[PDB]
Assembly symmetry: D2
Homo-oligomer: 231 residues x 4
Amino acid sequence: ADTIVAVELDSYPNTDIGDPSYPHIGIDIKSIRSKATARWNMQTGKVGTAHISYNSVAKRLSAVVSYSGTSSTTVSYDVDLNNVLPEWVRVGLSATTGLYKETNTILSWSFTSKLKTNSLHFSFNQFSQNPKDLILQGDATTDSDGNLQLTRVSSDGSPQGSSVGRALFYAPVHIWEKSAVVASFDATFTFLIKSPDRDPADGITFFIANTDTSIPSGSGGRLLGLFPDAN
Amino acid sequence: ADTIVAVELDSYPNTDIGDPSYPHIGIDIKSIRSKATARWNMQTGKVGTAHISYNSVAKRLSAVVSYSGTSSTTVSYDVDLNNVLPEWVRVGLSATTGLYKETNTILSWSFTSKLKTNSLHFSFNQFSQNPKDLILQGDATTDSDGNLQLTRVSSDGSPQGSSVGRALFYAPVHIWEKSAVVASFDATFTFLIKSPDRDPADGITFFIANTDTSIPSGSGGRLLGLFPDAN
Amino acid sequence: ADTIVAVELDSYPNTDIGDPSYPHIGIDIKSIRSKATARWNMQTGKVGTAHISYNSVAKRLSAVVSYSGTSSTTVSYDVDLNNVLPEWVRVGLSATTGLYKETNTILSWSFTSKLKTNSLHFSFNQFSQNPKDLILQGDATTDSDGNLQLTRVSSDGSPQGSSVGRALFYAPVHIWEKSAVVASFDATFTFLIKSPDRDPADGITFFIANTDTSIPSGSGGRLLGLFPDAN
Amino acid sequence: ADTIVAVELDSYPNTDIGDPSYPHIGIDIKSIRSKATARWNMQTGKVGTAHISYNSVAKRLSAVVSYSGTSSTTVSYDVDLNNVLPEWVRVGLSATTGLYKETNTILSWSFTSKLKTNSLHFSFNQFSQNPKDLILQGDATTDSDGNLQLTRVSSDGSPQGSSVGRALFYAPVHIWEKSAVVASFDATFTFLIKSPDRDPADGITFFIANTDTSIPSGSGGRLLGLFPDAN
Ligand SMILES: OC[C@H]1O[C@H](Oc2c[nH]c3ccc(Br)c(Cl)c23)[C@@H](O)[C@@H](O)[C@@H]1O
Ligand SMILES: OC[C@H]1O[C@H](Oc2c[nH]c3ccc(Br)c(Cl)c23)[C@@H](O)[C@@H](O)[C@@H]1O
Ligand SMILES: OC[C@H]1O[C@H](Oc2c[nH]c3ccc(Br)c(Cl)c23)[C@@H](O)[C@@H](O)[C@@H]1O
Ligand SMILES: OC[C@H]1O[C@H](Oc2c[nH]c3ccc(Br)c(Cl)c23)[C@@H](O)[C@@H](O)[C@@H]1O
Ligand SMILES: [Ca+2]
Ligand SMILES: [Ca+2]
Ligand SMILES: [Ca+2]
Ligand SMILES: [Ca+2]
Ligand SMILES: [Mn+2]
Ligand SMILES: [Mn+2]
Ligand SMILES: [Mn+2]
Ligand SMILES: [Mn+2]
């Protein structure tokens, strides 16, 4: 199967596959069962911001998720990613709904990777109706306001359940190379999660995988479109 | 056929299809017959640097080609590129040999595009043996020193004639959009041209084209791998 | 006196010192009497954006000023700036009021300069209460919302007349050097101009000058805090 | 006195004030007695490269120092720098000689800081004869090849003992702010250390301090121009 590293913004607690009993942000290394989590004061209807960073010297993957004036949650995990990930990757965003639902609207997304002794940076502050520099998978679409709807939304804006969708950047990324002195990446995205459900679900991830990654069978709902099971 | 905008570093004068009678840099808008040229004091065996820039407000495509301490040549052309190019493009480098030959060795290549009211930047200071973020066309390869050999070079380093090769960046680039306030791009590459021929040929280009661009039939030699004829 | 290059957003027509009879954007080379202007559909109470760019190869200073969904005005002028400006400069923003007034509120400001063969970039999306990386001149202050008020505003937000204020970046900028292949700069700022006056005044500039530049005597009002007279 | 955070490239072992018994790179938090060190295979006469990074989420200051094809040494230290440093800082490079000597030649220096919810980046690949964007302290000069000589070098290139010199960037840097979601910085410099001494000394640092920082009295030699004593 795919090799996966992800930062999950998990709005629904699936305690039966390892979630804490509350909304949380998590660092996922090849398993939906996060190696590290932090409690997420998830706000429906307000725009959030996530920042993710890593470098091969400090070897500490970190993420912070914030709502302006409201809250900020941070999670870190010490991991040598050059030991987990292949040399060439694609980076992306994923989102699911399940029994319960939410909009998983991406308003912006940027990413930088550096291979020091290669550089790649992209920034999207609007998404075009046919984004030729993105690989849209599952239900992911871009809409009339220029936003990226990772999961299905009806004509009036209502989120639908049992949705899975992902967007990967078109170009493979060279995230490590044996002659590199240091490899680093940074990622930021802003997101709007709306829901009429008392318990919204399921969440959004930023993720790095093998370049030929695709939505695994059975990855809906709590598996965030990333893993075929909860191992 | 393809839609082409290019800056050509033309080491061989083909006076019969419009070249001036000397090595020159040129700005090409949909024809190998440059809309503007400047005399190029082409230096065999020394590393050169080319800088190209454009923005949709000034509407002036410019290029400068230099050898440290030796020479610098500049050419500009006033053109609304949003009137020439499709909204989505790929960017690349091309090179040819013909009867006469030269190495067309790319040591580095960078590019930035901005869509203001989208950003894309890539930088290569070394090229890996299998560059998954590049579309290599024709004879283009990367070699053991980490350089990009656009045209065929033998085992010992000798350039071969009748070669054509191109390298495009993998991801389409969004170079204009009707809601943009301003669109801009910048490109830099460094290059080493070696030749045992008294009159080296044929040259190197940086070029922007339709995303599905490929080497046209009959584009070798003086056509720089860009055009199917000299119209 | 100072040596000045500026892009002026001139909200008040002073026809007696060379203004066209309407709000305009202008390119100023050592004189308030613009070398080039374009009609500016100036909008009171809406946030505007200005983009300015130049490179020493194309030698074309350009500016675009826009309100989202409303209007965009562009002005360009062909000028070799390395022939006007000293090698070391400071860059800044200026604004005035006079008999008539307006707020000259800077919401953001960024700038990049490149000296190719040096790089400097700064970006402000919020201004702190005591910006130690800015030289504030005249009436310029930063306020509680994190904005830069170039001209005097009363406690409730009312703009005052007979105000002059400027903000320069602290560090001198190396905008040309005789060994450079190409020198380039880019600048963006966003601005909010509010006024209860039927004819608001006087305007905002982005400007480059000798590093020891200061507000000239008698530069208020129509002189935009840049020039001691209307020569 | 000054508040100091530094990464030291310490070519001389002063075991009597806490150095390990070998050349080392070290992370210094308000004391020359490094909180963390790693053995440095210091190479005389070859160009080295140092990369330093930190972000306020991972809270891990890291540094890697390398010679191409030869060696690489890494040191990290977990520290909340927003708890050590004032909100406004200057960043710089320092170097000393003492009884023993070496050239402390800076060939390039770059730095980025980001204040997320401010950006500052500078890059020097050549240093001009009178760098107006640098505060040169002590013996620091720039020479005819465009390099930064932090410590005294004679007319022919011979390093002198009992030298101290520093170069700070002119503009204060805003490295933390109470409303920031995350603060980050990155720094790179390349350096050439030549010596006719069997045991070269004393070393080079990249350092962050109070904006009004100056060379303390008695900071020569093993104190690297940063501290007034070895507490
Ligand atoms: O969308 C949230 C969740 O909905 C389903 O799980 C349930 C949440 N509440 C329930 C109540 C009953 C059943 Br049966 C299920 Cl399967 C659930 C599944 O789709 C999960 O994958 C998902 O995490
Ligand atoms: O490589 C340089 C040139 O070589 C060929 O043209 C000639 C240059 N000198 C010649 C002499 C004879 C003939 Br026949 C040709 Cl076709 C040439 C052709 O391959 C040209 O496309 C190319 O520009
Ligand atoms: O603020 C707009 C203008 O106000 C003054 O000029 C006038 C605009 N309408 C007037 C009417 C009368 C007189 Br007297 C003046 Cl001086 C003006 C002067 O302060 C000008 O410098 C400025 O351009
Ligand atoms: O330059 C290297 C060192 O030279 C001096 O220390 C000595 C190194 N070998 C010695 C031998 C004798 C004496 Br006395 C001294 Cl003070 C030293 C002092 O200047 C030290 O600060 C410095 O670390
Ligand atoms: Ca879950
Ligand atoms: Ca030719
Ligand atoms: Ca006026
Ligand atoms: Ca020491
Ligand atoms: Mn979870
Ligand atoms: Mn030609
Ligand atoms: Mn005017
Ligand atoms: Mn030490």
